Design a binder for this molecule. Structure first.
Ligand SMILES: [Cs+]
Lengths: 227, 211, 211, 227
């Protein structure tokens, strides 16, 4: 007794690259109407692209307006980490503004339409493993924020969940010392890195009709690492 | 890309009523080969059934053998609570059915999963007593131990933790109770090819309740 | 919109080998409840099986009853050729198994389908003899008669006409033989909720051969 | 053992209205990248639109080029009837040019890329029931053409099939005399009209990986009418 599929208006922030790209392509093949944000390079073929820096509340507003006009109001928001990568105030605030406050900005802009239409799915994608304290603070902060949103908006059938990837095969992970790669594996029960498609599949589920009674959850996609 | 579907040999314990029944029916509609255990009331129409008291290790063993003969070795094990829902007797009865029972079915499933380098163990928490709380938290610790040991063999162990399901609302952000189908959909996902890199997780299906 | 999936009670005759087996396995992975008939070699692992000689009307009747008891009344009937693949004896043997056999299973299925206002009869033509040609064309005429009478009750009858399937290429535009999975996919569609307004059709699955 | 889904670049001619719209929406929800042609009014939200009159070979060429640039070369072509609706030469040639020659033009423009990439699905949608001789000639002509294409191109994994709808619920069918509506039913074993979604489901199948060994076929979607 599987709920019938509904084609949703989807916005995937940072959806032209890496894990964000895998997510956007998967949601498109699922049957959804998928738009992505980017910082200039553009969306790949078959996806509607809008340029926006998530540190800029006006650019966020214009992005959502453009998507609304293209494919209808955003029903499923996938917020990917704006940045991924001793410590200092500038580096701390830069990461917080992009990854935590940036997540707030897109969630806030999505919320009114989601509440009004009594449907919404906010799905926040944590930054990858693995600048320690700034990324740690922003990722944990997004989880606290998502829980607050879930507590406020779940009564309107608007949920907010977090996908927490562990070590995933990306360009930066492959650039890491051969020595760091094989020994990150010592912390991972699965004894292998995850793939972008493995993250995308979990997002596919959270966007689907099957995830309606999940709200305020953090689903780790990490081969057991974070236990 | 979305990974190709694989029809799995599935066993759902307590798969004849309530949430277990919803899970069994959903996994069958997904395309899996679904067997259930039950305590006497019989299996649902269409599905292979075996009578098991999960406090009985011998009965668990002969159930798995019967299922292997019918549809092949169990690849996906869904362990539903033996009891729903303080004396030493009541405490021990719930621990034996809900915690040790989970161990019995997990242990019996484990050899074949490890050998074939594929397994999904999915434990379903009871709906919501020191006894029930201990057994539910206990199963989570057990699952995490199994995930730590066996994830390297592509054998994962995850928990679905339902809140209030209809088979009080002030404490639930959704302002409604969940349905058995809403639990079943999460189990469908965890049984699927899309859940391969999830292990040792507890997924709450509670409308935000236990956040 | 795409109509919601419904898990149907399916019977596939000759569903234990070749194209029939591929059909049965595909329909089971689709989410249906799949039973097969066979002539002695047994059913595939996982699926409910009944021994039927389709020249025997009594054996057909007791097969349908056994299937009804197991998984509910047959909603989707897939009739595969009794024989694969000139004397009066050889002619009559092929007609009796392939044409009259199709009638026997169709007739037995028809009452319940009409009563419940749902039925899909799907006849699978033999792969490619005056006897075989007569029986294959005969089944098409029979199916068309059934479709004319019963489509008003949401009971349709369609034919899949395979060409050369691997269980010569110069006469095939595709320049290759078809696979059993390629036949099974067409049967999956005809069993689905998307085939509701198709009735009395013959769908060739032949890479262009019989065009 | 179902073939894994592949997201195809789809062009549905006349895909902004009626049966064509139902087809385009279904193929989009299936997971494909769907573009439609129209004659000016535009594509609905979530579908890429291009304007083209299928009597104009240059406009067809430009349409396919625009789709190619948007979503990749056309892999699945759904050619819907340009026109639907005593007899005279002008009315005969008008319908032949739109419905038969128009089908040729789009098939021809699709063919080279399909052959080169060793994949293609041409799906021709016959005009609805039910100007007699011109529509009859064009619909039968499209079937002969499709069979020729199937004979030539099936060796390159390029197939050509026809969906032949009977009486389907559309704006024009509903405009027909109450008396003609209920008595068209006397010719239909199903004893009801079909829906646009019933046609779209058959097109979904013909576009899918399950239809690979079907070529040169005419699938009637008519509740048994045309037996
Ligand atoms: Cs099944």
């Amino acid at each position: 007794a599987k709920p019938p599929f509904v084609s949703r208006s989807v916005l995937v922030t940072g959806g032209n690259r890496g894990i964000g790209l895998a997510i956007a392509q998967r949601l498109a093949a699922d049957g959804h109407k998928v738009a992505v944000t980017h910082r200039g390079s553009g969306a790949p073929k078959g996806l509607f692209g809008v340029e926006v820096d998530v540190t800029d509340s006006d650019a966020v507003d214009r992005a959502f307006t453009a998507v609304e006009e293209h494919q209808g109001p955003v029903e499923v928001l996938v917020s990917n980490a704006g940045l991924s990568a001793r410590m200092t105030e500038e580096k701390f605030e830069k990461v917080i503004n992009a990854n935590l406050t940036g997540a707030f900005r897109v969630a806030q802009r999505a919320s009114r339409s989601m509440q009004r239409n009594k449907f919404g799915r906010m799905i926040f994608i944590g930054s990858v493993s693995g600048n320690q304290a700034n990324y740690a603070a922003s990722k944990a902060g997004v989880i606290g924020m998502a829980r607050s949103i879930a507590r406020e908006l779940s009564k309107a059938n608007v949920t907010a969940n977090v996908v927490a990837p562990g070590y995933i095969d990306t360009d930066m992970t492959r650039a890491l010392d051969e020595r760091i790669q094989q020994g990150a594996l010592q912390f991972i029960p699965a004894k292998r890195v995850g793939t972008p498609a493995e993250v995308a599949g979990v997002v596919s589920f959270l966007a689907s009709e099957d995830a309606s009674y999940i709200s305020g959850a953090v689903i780790p996609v990490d081969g057991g690492m974070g236990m």
